[PDB]
Amino acid sequence: TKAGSLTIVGTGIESIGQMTLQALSYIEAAAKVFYCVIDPATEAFILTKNKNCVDLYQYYDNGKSRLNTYTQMSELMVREVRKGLDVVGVFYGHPGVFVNPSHRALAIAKSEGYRARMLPGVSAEDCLFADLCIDPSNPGCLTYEASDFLIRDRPVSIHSHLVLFQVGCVGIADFNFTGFDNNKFGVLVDRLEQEYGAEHPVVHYIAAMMPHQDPVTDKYTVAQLREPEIAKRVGGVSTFYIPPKARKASNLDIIRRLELLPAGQVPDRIYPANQWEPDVPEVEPYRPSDQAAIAQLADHAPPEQYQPLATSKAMSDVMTKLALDPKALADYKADHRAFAQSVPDLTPQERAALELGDSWAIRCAMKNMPSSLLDAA
Amino acid sequence: KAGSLTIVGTGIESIGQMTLQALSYIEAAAKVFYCVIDPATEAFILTKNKNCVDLYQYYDNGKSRLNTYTQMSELMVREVRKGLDVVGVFYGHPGVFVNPSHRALAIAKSEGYRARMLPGVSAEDCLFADLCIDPSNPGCLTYEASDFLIRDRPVSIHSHLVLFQVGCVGIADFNFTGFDNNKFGVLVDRLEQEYGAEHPVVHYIAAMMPHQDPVTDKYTVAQLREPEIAKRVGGVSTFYIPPKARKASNLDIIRRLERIYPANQWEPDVPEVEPYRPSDQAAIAQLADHAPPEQYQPLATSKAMSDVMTKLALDPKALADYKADHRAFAQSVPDLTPQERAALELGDSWAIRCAMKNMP
Numbered sequence: 001t002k003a004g005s006l007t008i009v010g011t012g013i014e015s016i017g018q019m020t021l022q023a024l025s026y027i028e029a030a031a032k033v034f035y036c037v038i039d040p041a042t043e044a045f046i047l048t049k050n051k052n053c054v055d056l057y058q059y060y061d062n063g064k065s066r067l068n069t070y071t072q073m074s075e076l077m078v079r080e081v082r083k084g085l086d087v088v089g090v091f092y093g094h095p096g097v098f099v100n101p102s103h104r105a106l107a108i109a110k111s112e113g114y115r116a117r118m119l120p121g122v123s124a125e126d127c128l129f130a131d132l133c134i135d136p137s138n139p140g141c142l143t144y145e146a147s148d149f150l151i152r153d154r155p156v157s158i159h160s161h162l163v164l165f166q167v168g169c170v171g172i173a174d175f176n177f178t179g180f181d182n183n184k185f186g187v188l189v190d191r192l193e194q195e196y197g198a199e200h201p202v203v204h205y206i207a208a209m210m211p212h213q214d215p216v217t218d219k220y221t222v223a224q225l226r227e228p229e230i231a232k233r234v235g236g237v238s239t240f241y242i243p244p245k246a247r248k249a250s251n252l253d254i255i256r257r258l259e260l261l262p263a264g265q266v267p268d269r270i271y272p273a274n275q276w277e278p279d280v281p282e283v284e285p286y287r288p289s290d291q292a293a294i295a296q297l298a299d300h301a302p303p304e305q306y307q308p309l310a311t312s313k314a315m316s317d318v319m320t321k322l323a324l325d326p327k328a329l330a331d332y333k334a335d336h337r338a339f340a341q342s343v344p345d346l347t348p349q350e351r352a353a354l355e356l357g358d359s360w361a362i363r364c365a366m367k368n369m370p371s372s373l374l375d376a377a
Numbered sequence: 378k379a380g381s382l383t384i385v386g387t388g389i390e391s392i393g394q395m396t397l398q399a400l401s402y403i404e405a406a407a408k409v410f411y412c413v414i415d416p417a418t419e420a421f422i423l424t425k426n427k428n429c430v431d432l433y434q435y436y437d438n439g440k441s442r443l444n445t446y447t448q449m450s451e452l453m454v455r456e457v458r459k460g461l462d463v464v465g466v467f468y469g470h471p472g473v474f475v476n477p478s479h480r481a482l483a484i485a486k487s488e489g490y491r492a493r494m495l496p497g498v499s500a501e502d503c504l505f506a507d508l509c510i511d512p513s514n515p516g517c518l519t520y521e522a523s524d525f526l527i528r529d530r531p532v533s534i535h536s537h538l539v540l541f542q543v544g545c546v547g548i549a550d551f552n553f554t555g556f557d558n559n560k561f562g563v564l565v566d567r568l569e570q571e572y573g574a575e576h577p578v579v580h581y582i583a584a585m586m587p588h589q590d591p592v593t594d595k596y597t598v599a600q601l602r603e604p605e606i607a608k609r610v611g612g613v614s615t616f617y618i619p620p621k622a623r624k625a626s627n628l629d630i631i632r633r634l635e636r637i638y639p640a641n642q643w644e645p646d647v648p649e650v651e652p653y654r655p656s657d658q659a660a661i662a663q664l665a666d667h668a669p670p671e672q673y674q675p676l677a678t679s680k681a682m683s684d685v686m687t688k689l690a691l692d693p694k695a696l697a698d699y700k701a702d703h704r705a706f707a708q709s710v711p712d713l714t715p716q717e718r719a720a721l722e723l724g725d726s727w728a729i730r731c732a733m734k735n736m737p
């Protein structure tokens with residue numbers, strides 16, 4: 001196989017703390033690090049973890065197209081790959097969510113035969129679910145870029161969540177150092193008034209970027225967005241959450257064919273209610289059957305089929321090492337058997353299970369389950 | 378008031394996908410409650426705090442999921458009511474397709490206790506990274522599979538579609554050996570009514586151990602009816618269904634507001650684009666002459682200033698002290714310059730930039 005690789009990782013949204021353990025370990029093991037982050041504390045942190053770093057942010061400019069900048073950023077990364085080096089690229093948030101240059105660079109490295117991988121990170125939408133206290137599963141989530149939303153006339157749903165990114169950059173294909181003018185914002189507000197109506201709520205969301213700050217979670221009407229004191233608050237790191245207008249009725253034919261309710265009855269919420277919806281009929285946390293479930297806790301014992309963790313220090317140490325040390329992981333992948341034979345202090349059962357590497361084998365080893373094959377080691 | 382509840386995630390891939398902040402809160406907690414599906418991750422949590430309880434033991438065969446979730450949340454909230462700092466830990470992102478966390482946080486908040494969710498890496502985040510797609514182009518619709526069929530939720534054939542919980546269509550129960558997915562054919566019918574019979578559906582399973590590869594298998598909608606294929610769909614399975622066409626642009630909107638590489642590899646019958654077109658080659662040529670613009674501000678900080686900003690993100694106690702009294706905290710940090718102390722005291726992002734980029 002060819003020598004040289006590209007791994008792209010994220011930093012998360014909130015400064016330093018939202019970086020993953022694996023992103024940190026790949027930054028440290030890199031021969032060379034390229035980064036694009038909007039926070040000085042996060043930049044300073046990255047520089048303490050590797051001696052060979054380059055700031056990609058310097059390739060943005062006034063009156064220079066974003067597409068030119070991304071071609072340049074990706075070419076800087078892949079040139080170092082072609083010289084045989086293990087390269088790491090670092091971007092704000094999740095490095096594949098609204099990020100052009102990472103997908104470009106990974107696809108180039110892949111087509112020329114180099115190992116190429118993206119590691120996921122915490123996105124702005126992840127932070128939004130956490131701070132606004134909503135689940136994308138109830139009642140579904142539609143996610144769009146605000147200009148693409150308008151240009152391609154993409155459909156909304158009044159019964160599901162709607163999230164809109166780049167609401168502070170409506171129809172802007174350029175970069176500007178000192179911020180922008182969001183003069184085309186009014187085209188967006190008209191569209192929202194059409195689809196939802198004038199008194200419908202819209203939450204202006206800004207996740208805290210520094211660990212001491214609070215999130216902006218300010219609820220407005222769509223009509224309030226036309227007032228200028230409110231419009232100027234919207235900027236480059238702003239997101240809109242639009243709650244549902246109403247609950248959608250159940251399809252009676254499907255509820256039958258999946259056989260959940262008997263005929264003759266009706267399906268008329270679960271606690272807690274979405275706090276941001278209009279006209280929300282409040283739900284009680286301690287209903288009668290919740291209280292019976294809580295009373296059963298006194299005589300609760302684990303069911304027979306429950307299997308408690310029953311591992312060793314040596315096995316836990318090696319599985320942790322594989323997740324936190326990329327070079328150890330690389331060595332394991334090249335030859336399972338040899339790596340397994342040289343781990344200190346493992347039992348024969350543990351060696352054989354690590355040699356196989358399969359999920360059922362690691363579980364047998366770490367939960368002390370009988371395996372005919374593994375107990376004979 | 379004494380007592381708090383913080384709920385955190387572990388991510389999807391064992392250990393490595395936990396955030397730095399999630400780990401620091403696990404370590405500082407008085408009591409820890411966890412629900413994870415990987416023994417290496419469970420073992421790692423138990424080395425980081427001496428007072429942990431496994432919430433997975435409250436599931437059972439034939440026992441309602443809702444009863445289990447009421448129990449999980451009450452166990453957490455009972456410790457908060459004794460004035461303790463409590464941490465709950467869930468797989469992935471702890472508020473994405475997870476009931477008990479939302480319930481416990483809302484109960485804690487309604488009784489006057491400090492309550493917060495910290496985000497984590499979800500199964501959808503992994504999907505974007507492993508399938509090499511971006512939800513921005515051309516939009517993403519995300520549903521729970523049963524809710525998708527019961528409420529007859531709309532498909533958008535011009536956008537990404539992601540369906541969670543495809544391996545248990547119509548099932549409210551738990552079972553330790555999993556369930557047979559016998560109502561699966563009701564999902565497939567709805568997919569073929571909406572997309573073609575030859576339209577691709579990608580069966581996605583993110584790797585759970587660090588050495589494993591993801592499942593990214595492309596099938597047709599029709600070949601989901603084959604029984605050898607349908608058995609592979611289980612409790613950690615997710616479906617990605619790519620767009621069937623490109624949506625037309627709106628001529629009116631374009632007036633008022635005044636393909637590109639790489640292509641989505643899963644869309645049927647899309648010609649791949651050239652990576653190095655002449656506009657790209659001209660972009661690359663300018664790198665030989667490139668100097669940083671006059672408005673570019675390089676990092677110019679001290680060791681003392683960087684150490685304190687790192688400490689506020691990695692040490693929950695130091696953060697609490699700082700929030701309580703900005704001035705007193707700033708005065709007690711050793712080796713800061715007078716400028717660095719005043720900036721920490723204000724604490725606004727513009728102030729911190731001044732100190733750490735030595736701007737005039």
Ligand SMILES: Nc1ncnc2c1ncn2[C@@H]1O[C@H](CSCC[C@H](N)C(=O)O)[C@@H](O)[C@H]1O
Pocket residue numbers: 013092093094095096097098099122123124125164165166167168205206207208209236237238239
């Ligand atoms: N602090 C914040 N709060 C809310 N939304 C934010 C944000 N920072 C960035 N965003 C959203 O993301 C867009 C920037 S593009 C970069 C997004 C990043 N890759 C991610 O993982 O989210 C903005 O237009 C905005 O809509």
Ligand SMILES: Nc1ncnc2c1ncn2[C@@H]1O[C@H](CSCC[C@H](N)C(=O)O)[C@@H](O)[C@H]1O
Pocket residue numbers: 389468469470471472473474475498499500501540541542543544581582583584585612613614615
């Ligand atoms: N390894 C994996 N790969 C793909 N999808 C997964 C997965 N593990 C869980 N899921 C998805 O999530 C559902 C479990 S619900 C819990 C999801 C978790 N909190 C998260 O953040 O993702 C499953 O039915 C499946 O659709």
